[PDB]
Amino acid sequence: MTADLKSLAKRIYEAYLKNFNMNKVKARVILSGKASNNPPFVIHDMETLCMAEKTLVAKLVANGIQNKEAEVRIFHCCQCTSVETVTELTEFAKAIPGFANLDLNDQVTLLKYGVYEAIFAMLSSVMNKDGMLVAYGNGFITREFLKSLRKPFCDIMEPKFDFAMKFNALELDDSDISLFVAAIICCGDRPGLLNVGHIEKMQEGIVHVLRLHLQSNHPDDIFLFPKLLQKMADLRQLVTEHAQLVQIIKKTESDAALHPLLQEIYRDMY
Amino acid sequence: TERHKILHRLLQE
Ligand SMILES: CC(C)(Oc1ccc(C(=O)c2ccc(Cl)cc2)cc1)C(=O)O
Numbered sequence: 408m409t410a411d412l413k414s415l416a417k418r419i420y421e422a423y424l425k426n427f428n429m430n431k432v433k434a435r436v437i438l439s440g441k442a443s444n445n446p447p448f449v450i451h452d453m454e455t456l457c458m459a460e461k462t463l464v465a466k467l468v469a470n471g472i473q474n475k476e477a478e479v480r481i482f483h484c485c486q487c488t489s490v491e492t493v494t495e496l497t498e499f500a501k502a503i504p505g506f507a508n509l510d511l512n513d514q515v516t517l518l519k520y521g522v523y524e525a526i527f528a529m530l531s532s533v534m535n536k537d538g539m540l541v542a543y544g545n546g547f548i549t550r551e552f553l554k555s556l557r558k559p560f561c562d563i564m565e566p567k568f569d570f571a572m573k574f575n576a577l578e579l580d581d582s583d584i585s586l587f588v589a590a591i592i593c594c595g596d597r598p599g600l601l602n603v604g605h606i607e608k609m610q611e612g613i614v615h616v617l618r619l620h621l622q623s624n625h626p627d628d629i630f631l632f633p634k635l636l637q638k639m640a641d642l643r644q645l646v647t648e649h650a651q652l653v654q655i656i657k658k659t660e661s662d663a664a665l666h667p668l669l670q671e672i673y674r675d676m677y
Numbered sequence: 678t679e680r681h682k683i684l685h686r687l688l689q690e
Pocket residue numbers: 450456459462463466481482484485488541542543546548
């Protein structure tokens with residue numbers, strides 16, 4: 408692995424640290440409890456949900472969400488976080504060499520299909536087997552509380568926890584995750600791409616650095632790179648199933664609303 | 678791109 412490949416990896420890592428407000432080293436510090444005796448607030452039932460929502464009152468009242476069903480309020484807040492992460496992913500993509508040179512239409516296409524694969528990959532960093540951090544690591548919503556919601560809402564996050572537990576067993580660090588997210592965005596087989604050749608060359612460059620990076624950083628996990636190739640396939644299927652659930656909610660839940668940036672992404676997706 | 682106005686705006690900032 409030559410100095411040029413090491414540089415590209417370190418620059419992708421910098422762009423990741425500079426654009427994402429949360430990362431795995433921070434999340435594991437919080438989840439471990441070994442750097443402070445003041446843990447995040449735990450949302451584990453309706454009462455502690457409502458207590459947390461006293462802090463979030465301005466976010467809820469902003470869009471007149473405060474009197475909706477609990478399930479709708481929870482996933483309103485979750486959507487707001489997805490919008491933030493899409494916005495960050497867009498800045499991160501612009502820092503990937505060659506991405507900003509692409510046809511603007513292709514940039515939209517890559518982000519349209521790539522952002523949720525990257526979202527659920529990175530979401531794994533803030534998850535453990537019992538719940539997930541929220542509000543920039545300041546809260547922790549339990550997996551069992553989410554499972555206790557009424558259908559369909561109880562079925563939204565559990566498959567993401569299932570994915571995250573196996574993904575986290577790979578013990579990736581942020582230097583790995585930054586290249587993995589770049590590999591997810593720079594994908595040559597998204598529908599509707601206009602310059603598939605230019606993109607495939609970008610994809611090859613990133614996947615090559617990703618492979619050599621993993622062989623250097625995890626020399627004892629010999630087939631980590633093929634494992635991660637499978638995880639990219641798994642994420643595509645996870646997002647397909649997620650988008651089908653978003654469609655069910657739209658058709659069955661009249662009191663729930665979809666943020667307009669997320670409308671654009673989901674419209675005509677799969 | 679006409680159907681992704683918000684995403685299109687983010688990419689041009
Ligand atoms: C500044 C602050 C507190 O930032 C938030 C960031 C993330 C979330 C969440 O994602 C979330 C989701 C579900 C619940 Cl139940 C609680 C929190 C909420 C607020 C806000 O905007 O007020």
